[PDB]
């Protein structure tokens, strides 16, 4: 791997210095951060084309960079906002365009920590109804009351982990519309043919790596701390 | 002063037929001009680019596309639209002789050919002895959509697509619930229109 980014995910509190660094082994003059946004594309923060020369992408304000070597370009959220939650991407360029991107941070802001919360998952089984009607049969996962939207969703089946049959939705939705601080939520759908639904050897789990707090972060409440972790539902197959 | 516009941030093509994505910029002098693709939760993937050489440029996997000076235009063409081009494309620009900038971006919606509709809501039980559910809408072709729900306790989601590749079988589907025992699956898609010949089980 040329260029490497790290953190690969992060979660801060607001009014937080926040680091974000980039390497390269190949030595280009030329490296960028940039940030996405969904229905912004990938906006320029700063750019830099040698040890201390730096410049002024479009979305600078809030942020600094440093370039300390050839290989790296590290980029400083000086007070973290919530409008810093974004996918953050590097890139190193050779003198004709030839981009390459880092894999990407995810970086959430949040006001307060104290509202962060790991998802309930259920599974759910297939109708008799669509079984009788289609010999298929959908299982349905919903991941409920989660904070921040940060989640990634699987299907497990016997032990690995399986792609086809599957549709998981591309947002969590808000639970509470209304509120800066909604939880979330998000389902997915796992369709096998009634058959292997029908076999009661057969093992079906829904799997959702949540992101949230670290070791390090402190907690006041009674409710359990909401550390990241791995959430899972799970159900057999049956024939009644 | 140079710019990449790309419009529609989400766009639909049908299974198998062609493929168009546009791109035109504002450079006076011709640019370089460059196609990435985005899959979720993943990194960035050029697909082509103009380099001032053939005008005519040729990808991977089929895509082309055709730098036009005099319409200012670099669509992005594939000839079959397929399940797997589901993505989010981006056109970029060289500017300032020092950097690429970015469109705003356009997801590609592949529309699955349902030739045998036979669209249903179903109710789906907890795996585990709560008597929670849930609605499944599923089985609709390309004409139907899911309008959001007009109670805030009544949640549903989008429209989406899976693709069985047991069986080489595609499916529409959403999901709705509620915390209400009372809310019923026969009520639960009242704010979408829905095939006249739906299945309703009982």
């Known amino acids: 791997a040329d260029v490497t980014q790290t953190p690969r995910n992060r979660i801060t509190k607001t009014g937080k210095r926040i680091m974000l660094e980039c390497s390269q082994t190949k030595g280009h003059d030329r490296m960028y951060w940039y940030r996405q946004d969904p229905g912004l594309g990938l906006r320029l923060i700063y750019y830099s084309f040698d040890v201390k020369d730096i410049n002024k992408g479009e979305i600078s304000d809030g942020y600094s960079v440093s370039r300390q070597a050839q290989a790296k370009f590290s980029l400083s959220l000086e007070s973290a906002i919530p409008n810093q939650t974004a996918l953050y991407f590097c890139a190193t360029s050779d003198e004709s365009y030839g981009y390459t991107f880092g894999s990407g941070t995810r970086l959430t802001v949040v006001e307060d920590l104290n509202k962060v919360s790991p998802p309930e998952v259920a599974v759910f089984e297939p109708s008799e109804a669509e079984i009788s009607h289609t010999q298929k049969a959908t299982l349905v996962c919903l991941a409920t009351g989660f904070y921040p939207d940060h989640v990634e969703l699987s299907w497990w089946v016997n032990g690995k982990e399986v792609h086809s049959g599957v549709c998981t939705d591309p947002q969590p939705l808000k639970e509470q519309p209304a509120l800066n601080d909604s939880r979330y939520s998000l389902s997915s759908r796992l369709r096998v043919s009634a058959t292997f639904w029908q076999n009661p050897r057969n093992h079906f789990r829904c799997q959702v790596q949540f992101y949230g707090l670290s070791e390090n972060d402190e907690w006041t409440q009674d409710r359990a701390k909401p550390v990241t972790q791995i959430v899972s539902a799970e159900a057999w197959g049956r024939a009644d | ?202």
């Open chain 2, 1 to 202: 002063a140079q710019s990449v516009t790309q419009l529609g941030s989400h766009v639909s093509v049908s299974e198998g037929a062609l493929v168009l994505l546009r791109c035109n910029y504002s450079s006076s002098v011709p640019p370089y001009l460059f196609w990435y693709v985005q899959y979720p939760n993943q990194g960035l993937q050029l697909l082509l680019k103009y380099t001032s050489a053939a005008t005519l440029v040729k990808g991977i996997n089929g895509f082309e596309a055709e730098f036009k000076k005099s319409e200012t235009s670099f669509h992005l063409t594939k000839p079959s639209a397929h399940m797997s081009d589901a993505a989010e494309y981006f056109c970029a620009v060289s500017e300032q002789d020092d950097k690429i900038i970015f469109g705003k971006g356009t997801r590609l919606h592949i529309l699955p050919n349902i030739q045998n509709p036979d669209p249903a809501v179903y109710q789906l039980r907890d795996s585990k002895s709560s008597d929670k559910s849930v609605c499944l809408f599923t089985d609709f072709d390309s004409q139907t959509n899911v309008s959001q729900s007009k109670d805030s306790d009544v949640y549903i989601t989008d429209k989406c697509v899976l693709d069985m590749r047991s069986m080489d079988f595609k499916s529409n589907s959403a999901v709705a619930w509620s915390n209400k025992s009372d809310f019923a699956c026969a009520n639960a898609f009242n704010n979408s229109i829905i095939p006249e010949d739906t299945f309703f089980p009982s």
